[PDB]
Amino acid sequence: WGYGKHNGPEHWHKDFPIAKGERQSPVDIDTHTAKYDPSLKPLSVSYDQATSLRILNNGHAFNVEFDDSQDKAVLKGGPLDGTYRLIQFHFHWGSLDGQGSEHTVDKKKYAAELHLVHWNTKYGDFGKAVQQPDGLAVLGIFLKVGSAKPGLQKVVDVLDSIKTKGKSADFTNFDPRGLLPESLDYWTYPGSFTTPPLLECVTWIVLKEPISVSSEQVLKFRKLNFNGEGEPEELMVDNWRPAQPLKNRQIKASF
Ligand SMILES: [Hg+2]
Ligand SMILES: [Zn+2]
């Protein structure tokens, strides 16, 4: 599967029939139909003891991986019951600045979207959590082009080391707090992974506030490659899935 004409999102259903299921992601967040729900608790993001281990180009995005063998970087509160551990984050971006996010807001597409992936510790490990309707919680943050995000520069500088599919580089002591916006207001709905296997395991928490990155920071993302070393070069751009039908799910807003 991939993002091209012959293997991109509109073909995915042949190998992963859940693509056409009932709670697929991403979706358009219609701000006027989203229900303010005053029972939504504030999010609690405890990332101060986070341990990053490595960054990896896996052929469809680059992932920063974290040590999830103990409760070091956890998410709780908001719509969640329980503690969700951070296992990795990755981005989706476009070839141009006006596209790249997966989720849209009143049909507006942003330049990129960050997904911080967490699994529910009640289930023991990530592989068991992906068999559950509430096994994962993913935090989505929109990126728009403006001023440089200082906390993103460590990530941008290592990307040369992992240009092609399959390469990885050690990436310790990265603090994920530098990628957070000021406000933690959010929209939340039940959804899925946005890449194969597209399992319907995810409580999505999409933050209202975007972070800004500079044009030169997001340009470095665009130099990555989908291909492995020694294969023809295919630039890793537009690795995002289009919005899916909401199908009688309701988006709740914390604000
Ligand atoms: Hg699931
Ligand atoms: Zn993602």
From Swiss-Prot:
Keyword Acetylation in record? yes
Q: Which GO terms describe its molecular function?
A: arylesterase activity; carbonate dehydratase activity; cyanamide hydratase activity; zinc ion binding
Any idea where the Alpha-carbonic anhydrase domain is? 1-255
Q: Which cofactor does it need?
A: Zn(2+); Co(2+)
State where the protein is found.
Answer: Cytoplasm; Cell membrane
Q: What is the effect of changing T195H?
A: Higher affinity for bicarbonate. Enhanced proton transfer capacity
What residues does substrate bind to?
T194, T195
What cellular component GO annotations does this protein have? Answer: apical part of cell; cytoplasm; cytosol; extracellular exosome; myelin sheath; plasma membrane
Q: What would changing N58A do, according to UniProt?
A: Reduced activity
Result, substituting Y3F: Enhanced activity
Site positions for Fine-tunes the proton-transfer properties of H-64, renumbered to this chain?
A: Y3, N58, N63
What is the pH-activity profile?
Optimum pH is 6-8.
Q: Which family does it belong to?
A: Belongs to the alpha-carbonic anhydrase family.
Protein name in the entry: Carbonic anhydrase 2
What is the organism field in this record?
A: Homo sapiens (Human)
The top of its lineage is: Eukaryota, Metazoa, Chordata, Craniata, Vertebrata
Q: Tell me the name of the encoding gene.
A: CA2
